[PDB]
A and B are shown apart, each in its own frame.
With several copies, the nearest count.
Chain A
Amino acid sequence: EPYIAWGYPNLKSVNELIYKRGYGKINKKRIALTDNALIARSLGKYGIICMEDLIH
């Protein structure tokens, strides 16, 4: 607690965090989420295939 500030994000915070600063850990690399194919290739087996699915 002395080291963190936390709270309850709303929908708009989740959108802007994923859209502006969203990077994926793809093959241990920090890859910018520029295309939906990056999400669908690693998380498509869970039904998550787009930035909207990830945000949801």
Chain B
Amino acid sequence: YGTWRKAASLKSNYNLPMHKMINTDLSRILKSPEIQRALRAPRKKIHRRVLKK
């Protein structure tokens, strides 16, 4: 099946398929300081329905 550096030597045209996402560690990506620097602060307060008095 070959490497990504070299094609397969027993299939004459085949090479390993490529990744459309190199780093699948989603938690590492989201927690990275460059991602965290660009984010606005979370809006974690729940605003429930106000009973109109």
Q: Chain A: interface residue count, which band?
A: under 10
Q: Chain B: interface residue count, which band?
A: under 10
Interface residues of B in 4-53 (CB under 8 A from A): 50, 52-53
A54 contacts the other chain (CB 8 A): no
Contact residues in B for A34 (Cβ distance below 8 Å):
50, 52-53
Interface residues of A in 2-40 (CB under 8 A from B): 32, 34
Contact residues in B for A32 (Cβ distance below 8 Å):
50, 52
Contact residues in A for B53 (Cβ distance below 8 Å):
34
Closest to A31 in B: B50
Closest to B52 in A: A32
Closest to B49 in A: A32
What is the CB-to-nearest-CB distance from A9 to chain B, in angstroms, rounded to a whole number? Answer: 22
Closest to A22 in B: B52
Using a CB–CB cutoff of 8 Å, the interface residues on chain A facing chain B are 32, 34
The 5 closest A-B pairs by CB, nearest first: A32-B52, A34-B50, A34-B52, A32-B50, A34-B53
